[PDB]
């Protein structure tokens, strides 16, 4: 026999058998062949044969395992795999602060999270004083992993139950193993259509390969640790996820467990910086910062305290980075602004709906806050002035035609460039006329009016009359995976999330920024009253309209490229009206539906209260909300609030013609259009424009000036979610520096 190892380049000058399974085990002596698992782990040819040979006592145990490993995995069941999976002793790190030595557990002991959580040397003299096995240090040599035969496979991963559709060994888990918020679906399932904020359990994302190139050859270990980390975060999103919390949940045999534990911290911090975990409204204070002291030296001025500014500020603050927020208005929130004065209900003057809760940051934050959302039902009757609910067949007939018009638009645009763009509204019109011409079919006036409702609904979505919006690019964002699942009413209002994000941050109100100078060593920021601020980096999150107006003086000036992109998007607008009543007059006719539609008498009036929203899902209080979109936004600019209220009440008395309607006892009418520091509702792509505009606006300048806000998120434009995510995005970029 020999004392040398098979593996070329192995530094084991004295192989010893860890298995001792054969009554003939060679121990530290001679054997025909030493089989290598790592630089510190070998088993002799006798113990090899003990399992591998049919006439040996350990053959049963190896064939049974070989069967489970077949009905469960995609990797070949080799004896070395069996060894690493079944016989290799566990290692656990002493938890005594001043020791922290790694210890080998005896071969019969099965390591559990509870054992790892509290382990100290000797747990069955000063056991902590016994020297650490010399093999432990070796593990932190980069070549150590390179001479590992097989990649680690985790046991009982917290991620396991979420991945039952994959081969465990394809996602870093062991084939021989084995009440979450329904909105948490972090992992793509096999054969799934795209959905927002999902990762593949079996493939590294582009940014991941960028940060951890050493895993491009074999991503097994990374995926297992990343998947575990996400599972743990979503299992409990109310606490910071730390390495200490993860380590006990890393269960794998062998010295490799030490390498896994050493990697988890790197991956944790990357996940945190990028905003995948330890995020949302989670708050962390002095001596709880989520990123190492290495990121802390730096400073930032954030301009704007809406969802985007507050997202970035929350992230950076939690990171340990010095942040100051400058807000123009006497309040935070921006286009989030809730009226809490209504009886028993919260009514948003701005945003209040969550579009697609699955994996939505907003859904996460509701979880963290213990907030419940109301899922909208599907029903939305199209009610005519005055009284008549639209015939179901007429309804279906015109829905079909409306969407058929969209199909042909999407067909027309395929070969058109930005230089040939035409307005969506004009395109739809032409296609419609040319269809009635082609086919002698003729629609009634009502059928035409129902079509107008649908058109109005497009205008609400874009915040613009359709003759302004791009036929080519109106729905550009759907090129990317969107947020799936329920649309909900955020009944408590977005303001609760806003408050929570801002709590304890350094925020200066009534401080409108007028000048940003990034020509010197650090950014000089000056307010409209001449007050000076300075920091290493600046993030601007002001609304698109304000960038278009040029209310902030940039030195040096924004690029011509940026200006073209800024002007190629539209500062979309809608206004809201809310009305309180003495009683729920609509219950008889509406029958519990979350909303009801209003068939337009004419094309010109189509955006005047097209949809009415019942603002109490408990059906107890009497508040209606409606919207003003498209052409009707203009028609209302010279009308005072009372006049708008009069037209809304006139509309309601028409919609409910065959009954009486009580007078409203309290109401508001929004004027976002003329709020000086906002001047809009949400962005859209103007004719001639491209989705790429969102990317161009998003582009930092010289890693010194950064941009966020709903109009900088190409994937998720318009929304609080999108604005929030753009802030997380920029916080990651800024923290990397």
């Amino acid at each position: 026999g020999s004392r040398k190892c098979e593996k070329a380049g192995c530094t084991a000058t004295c192989p010893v058998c860890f298995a001792s399974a054969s009554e003939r085990c060679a121990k530290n002596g001679y054997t025909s062949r030493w089989y290598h698992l790592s630089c510190g782990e070998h088993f002799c040819n006798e113990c090899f044969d003990h399992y591998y040979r049919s006439h040996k006592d350990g053959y049963d145990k190896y064939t049974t395992w070989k069967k489970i490993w077949t009905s469960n995995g995609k990797t070949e069941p080799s004896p070395k795999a069996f060894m690493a999976d079944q016989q290799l002793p566990y290692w656990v790190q002493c938890t005594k602060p001043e020791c922290r030595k790694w210890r080998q557990l005896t071969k019969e002991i099965q390591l559990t999270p509870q054992i790892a959580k509290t382990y100290r040397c000797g747990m069955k003299s000063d056991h902590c004083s016994l020297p650490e096995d010399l093999r432990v240090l070796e593990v932190s040599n980069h070549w150590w992993y390179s001479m590992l035969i097989l990649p680690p496979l985790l046991k009982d991963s917290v991620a396991a139950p979420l991945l039952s559709a994959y081969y465990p060994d394809c996602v870093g888990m062991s084939p021989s193993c084995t009440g979450m918020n329904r909105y948490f679906q972090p992992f793509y399932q096999p054969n799934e259509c795209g959905k927002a904020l999902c990762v593949r359990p079996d493939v590294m994302e582009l940014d991941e390969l960028y940060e951890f190139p050493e895993y491009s050859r074999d991503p097994t270990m990374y995926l297992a640790l990343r998947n575990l980390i996400l599972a743990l975060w979503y299992t409990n999103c109310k606490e910071a996820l730390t390495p200490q919390k993860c380590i006990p949940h890393i269960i794998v045999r062998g010295l490799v467990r030490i390498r896994c534990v050493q990697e988890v911290e790197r991956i944790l911090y990357f996940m945190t910086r990028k905003g995948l975990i330890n995020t949302g409204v989670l708050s962390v204070g002095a001596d709880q910062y989520l990123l190492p002291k290495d990121y802390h030296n730096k400073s930032v001025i954030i301009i704007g305290a809406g969802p985007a500014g507050l997202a970035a500020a929350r992230q950076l603050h939690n990171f340990g980075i010095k942040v100051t927020v400058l807000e123009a208005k006497d309040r935070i929130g921006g286009r989030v602004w809730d009226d809490k004065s209504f009886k028993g209900v919260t009514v948003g003057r701005g945003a209040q709906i969550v579009n697609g809760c699955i994996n939505n940051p907003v859904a996460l934050m509701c979880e963290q806050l213990g907030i419940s959302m109301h899922k909208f039902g599907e029903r939305c009757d199209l009610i005519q002035e005055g009284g008549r609910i639209t015939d179901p067949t007429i309804d279906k007939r015109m829905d079909f035609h409306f969407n058929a018009l969209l199909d042909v638009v999407s067909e027309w645009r395929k070969d058109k460039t930005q230089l040939q763009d035409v307005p969506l509204g004009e395109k739809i019109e032409e296609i419609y006329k040319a269809f009635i011409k082609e086919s002698g079919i003729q629609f009634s006036e009502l059928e035409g009016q129902v079509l107008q409702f649908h058109l109005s609904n497009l205008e609400y979505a874009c915040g613009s009359n359709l003759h302004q919006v791009s036929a080519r690019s109106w729905d550009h964002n759907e090129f990317f995976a969107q947020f799936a699942g329920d649309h909900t009413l955020l009944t408590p209002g977005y303001s609760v999330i806003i408050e929570k994000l801002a709590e304890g941050l350094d925020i200066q109100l009534k401080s409108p920024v007028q000048c940003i100078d990034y020509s010197g060593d650090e950014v000089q920021v000056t307010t409209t009253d001449g007050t000076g601020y300075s920091a290493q980096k600046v993030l601007v999150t002001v609304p698109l309209a304000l960038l278009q107006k040029g209310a902030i003086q940039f030195n040096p000036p924004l690029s011509e490229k940026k200006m073209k992109a800024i002007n190629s998007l539209g500062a979309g607008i809608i206004e809201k009206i809310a009305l309180q009543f003495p009683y729920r007059f609509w219950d008889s006719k509406v029958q519990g539906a979350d909303f009801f539609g209003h068939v337009p008498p004419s094309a010109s009036k189509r955006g005047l209260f097209a949809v009415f929203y019942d603002m109490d899902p408990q059906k107890k209080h009497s508040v209606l909300m409606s919207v003003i979109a498209g052409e009707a936004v203009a028609s209302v600019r010279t009308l005072d609030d009372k006049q708008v209220l009069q037209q809304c009440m006139a509309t309601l008395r028409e919609l409910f013609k065959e009954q009486e309607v009580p007078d409203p006892t309290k109401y508001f009418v929004t004027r976002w259009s003329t709020d000086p520091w906002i001047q809009m509702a949400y962005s859209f792509v103007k004719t001639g424009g491209s989705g790429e505009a969102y990317d161009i606006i998003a582009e930092d300048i010289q890693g010194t000036v950064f941009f966020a806000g709903e109009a900088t998120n190409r994937h998720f434009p318009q929304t609080v979610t999108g604005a929030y995510l753009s802030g997380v995005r920029e916080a990651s970029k800024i923290a990397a520096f």
């Binding site: 994959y166 096999p190 909303f595 539609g597 318009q718």
Partner: peptide, 26 residues
């Protein structure tokens, strides 16, 4: 954008649906 719609969502004009076909799948 279409994604802003809750009540009475439009459906026409959508690009074909893509479906992840990974090998890691049992």
């Amino acid at each position: 954008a279409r994604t802003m719609q809750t009540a009475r969502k439009s459906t026409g004009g959508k690009a074909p649906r893509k479906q992840l076909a990974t090998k890691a799948a049992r």
